Structure formats: structure tokens, C-alpha cells
Amino acid sequence: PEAYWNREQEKLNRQYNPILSMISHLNYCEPDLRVTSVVTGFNNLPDRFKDFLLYLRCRNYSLLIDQPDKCAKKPFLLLAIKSLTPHFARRQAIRESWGQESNAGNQTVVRVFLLGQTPPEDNHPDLSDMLKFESEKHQDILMWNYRDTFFNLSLKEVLFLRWVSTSCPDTEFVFKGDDDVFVNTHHILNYLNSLSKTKAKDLFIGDVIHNAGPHRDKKLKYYIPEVVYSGLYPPYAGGGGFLYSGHLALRLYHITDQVHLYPIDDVYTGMCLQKLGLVPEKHKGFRTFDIEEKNKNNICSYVDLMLVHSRKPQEMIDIWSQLQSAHLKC
Ligand SMILES: *[C@@H]1O[C@H](CO)[C@@H](O[C@@H]2O[C@H](CO)[C@@H](O[C@@H]3O[C@H](CO)[C@@H](O)[C@H](O)[C@@H]3O)[C@H](O)[C@H]2NC(C)=O)[C@H](O)[C@H]1NC(C)=O
Ligand SMILES: O=c1ccn([C@@H]2O[C@H](COP(=O)(O)OP(=O)(O)O)[C@@H](O)[C@H]2O)c(=O)[nH]1
Ligand SMILES: *[C@@H]1O[C@H](CO)[C@@H](O)[C@H](O)[C@H]1NC(C)=O
Ligand SMILES: [Cl-]
Ligand SMILES: [Cl-]
Ligand SMILES: [Mg+2]
């Protein structure tokens, strides 16, 4: 392969598969000097691709803030919300609205926020003291010691899956979502309790996208050069969040070593499911393109909804407030 990622992944494929055969890629954290000579036009690429390619083989990052007994009592649903250090208003609105922990019929919902580091080296304002004050006051902050960037989000996925393997392998289901999304948690709990025991074992639902490919428009957010990745993407769910079983979370983590990190986290999770022999299932309750504006103020449009992107902190509280009495009028 000419594309860098496709080639290195097929090297991993031969490493983990003896039949394909007729410098740790996992904890070598020095800059990989060889990329500058092997990818055409390296020093003319954006800075994010240069950082992603130089340190592709480093993923043994450690927890700086932990909540090791978040799942001391077995949870039915684990809410894992990706967040950024300065997003205090988002995390707080999620705490008071749809991400509040509960135990209705002893079906335990627990919440964690997934953060990286916003170090001063990137000219980030020092907010660590307030993050500590929030971490001890709410005990829902998980934070590793890597640069929380847009191209390091697949690293956030892997590190979160390791935390589930270590501190929460007993949870029945996992919802992984964004901090700018509204989630009808009541509707998700109803859906989980309506599943067959067979379907619940390998659950993985979301706004699934088939036959997608990298965006070549350099001006786009998810732009991927052809020197980096070639071909089509595997089926994957994205756009705000997906829902799956705890059994599948343990299987997903244990093949992550066999898949190279990718600048798009949702594509990486899709690559991981495809190697397990599974296909993510499309569920139309994940309204990643929002809902029609003529209904954006009708609370009945949120009742049988799983997820809607996107919402500001005030709207999450407003919608969740109106949702509590929607059964008396919807
Ligand atoms: C994902 O997170 C990792 C860990 O935070 C980032 O790795 C870090 O990358 C920076 C550069 O972006 C490295 O600093 C550089 O060090 C070299 C000398 O080796 C120096 O010449 C540069 O001026 C700069 O100081 C840092 O060492 C490295 N840390 C680790 C632990 O590997 C990575 O960049 C992030 N990826 C993305 C796409 O943001
Ligand atoms: O470096 C980053 C950038 C994004 N996010 C999280 O990603 C989610 C949504 O990101 P965004 O809305 O920018 O993605 P988009 O909707 O544009 O695809 C939010 O939870 C952010 O906190 C993150 O954790 N680290
Ligand atoms: C990963 O482990 C190696 C030891 O093989 C070590 O040299 C490296 O610094 C570790 N990386 C991180 C980010 O801790
Ligand atoms: Cl079913
Ligand atoms: Cl609608
Ligand atoms: Mg978003």
C-alpha cells in the first residue's frame, strides 16, 4: 500500500495472524523518525497529522484522576461522556439533566466524563485547580496524561475501554457520547429492558454509516490525505454517541492492540467492530442531524428519541425539565 495507515495496519495483520505469513507499536513513545522519509509530503502536512504520525505507537498513558469504585456496585448502564477541560457548563448541565445517576428498580446508572490534558504547551489556560475542585466535588472525572486533541480521540476510546476492563467490566451496557448532545436516558432504559437476552449480548447501535470514505477536501474538519489512508471506511456509528453491551466492551478492548489508532475515533471503533466480525446496527432514534425545526419546541418529539445533536447546556436542562411531565401530554 502507498497509504501509510493501510500499510502499517497490514503489517499488524501479519503480526497477529500466522496464516497471513503463508519496535513496539504499543508503548514506543519516542517520536517515530521514520515517518518523515516514508510519507510523501510530511513536512507540508498540517501539524495534527504530523503529531499523529510521529507518536502513533504510544498508548500506555496513565490515569491522573480516577474513580476506581464508580462501579463498586454493578451498574445497568454506564454513561461515558467525552469532554474537554474548560467545558464546565456542559458537564454540569449533564449532571443535573439526563446524565444524573439513579437506581429506579435497582437499575443503576453511573456517569463518568472522559478528559485528557489541556497542557500549557498548547497555550491552554491553567484550569487544573478548578478541575481538581470539580473532580472531588462530583467524583465523575476520568483524566489521563495525554494531549486531549481531536486526532487523539481514538486514544481516548482505547484508554476508556481499558478503564472498563479494569474498573467496570461488570456493567450491563455502555453509552459513549459527546457533551454537546441531548440523550433521552429514560427512553434508552426502556429500550435496553425491551431487548431479548440474545440481542443484548452483542448490542451495538447508533447512527451507523456504510460505504463512507475519507473526505479529501482539505478545508473540511475530517479531511484525511490520500497518503495517510486509502479506500473506504468500515461500517461505523457516529455523530454524537452509540450504545452497546458491557460484554462487547470487553471484546472491543482486547482487539484494540491489533488495530492502529486513527485520527477519527468513531471510524476507529468501527474498524474494531469489523475485526470482531460484527456490524454496528443502525437505529433511527439517534438524531444526529437534529430534529425538524417546526418540532424543536414540541416535547413529544423527544419522548421516543434516543439522542439529538446538538444542544447547549441550558437547552439540555430545559428539555429534560419538560420531559418529566411529557407522559401526561404525549
Ligand atoms: C496525543 O497525545 C500525546 C501525549 O500527550 C502527544 O504526544 C506529545 O506530542 C508532543 C508534540 O505535539 C511532544 O512534544 C515534543 O517533543 C519533541 C521532542 O521529542 C520537541 O521537539 C517538540 O518541540 C515537542 O516538545 C511530546 O513529547 C509528546 N508526548 C508523549 C508522551 O509522547 C501527541 O502529540 C498527541 N497527538 C495529537 C495528534 O495531538
Ligand atoms: O479534543 C477534543 C475534541 C472534542 N472532544 C469531545 O467531543 C465531543 C463533541 O465534539 P465536536 O462537537 O467538536 O464533534 P463534531 O460534532 O463536530 O463532529 C465533545 O464531548 C467534546 O468534549 C474531546 O473530548 N476532545
Ligand atoms: C510506555 O512504556 C515504555 C516502556 O517500554 C516507556 O519507555 C514509555 O515512556 C511509556 N509511555 C508512556 C506515555 O508512559
Ligand atoms: Cl430484540
Ligand atoms: Cl420530528
Ligand atoms: Mg458535537
Numbering used by the authors: 55 to 76, 90 to 397
Give excerpts from the publication.
β1,3-N-acetylglucosaminyltransferases (B3GNTs) are Golgi-resident glycosyltransferases involved in the biosynthesis of poly-N-acetyl-lactosamine chains. They catalyze the addition of the N-acetylglucosamine to the N-acetyl-lactosamine repeat as a key step of the chain elongation process. Among the characterized B3GNTs, B3GNT2 is the major poly-N-acetyl-lactosamine synthase, and deletion of its coding gene dramatically reduced the cell surface poly-N-acetyl-lactosamine and led to hypersensitive and hyperresponsive immunocytes.
The six structures presented here were solved in different space groups and the number of molecules in the asymmetric unit also varied. The recombinant proteins used for crystallization contain residues Ser31–Cys397 or Lys45–Cys397, but only residues Pro55–Cys397 are well defined in the electron density maps, except for a disordered loop between residues Leu77 and Ser88.
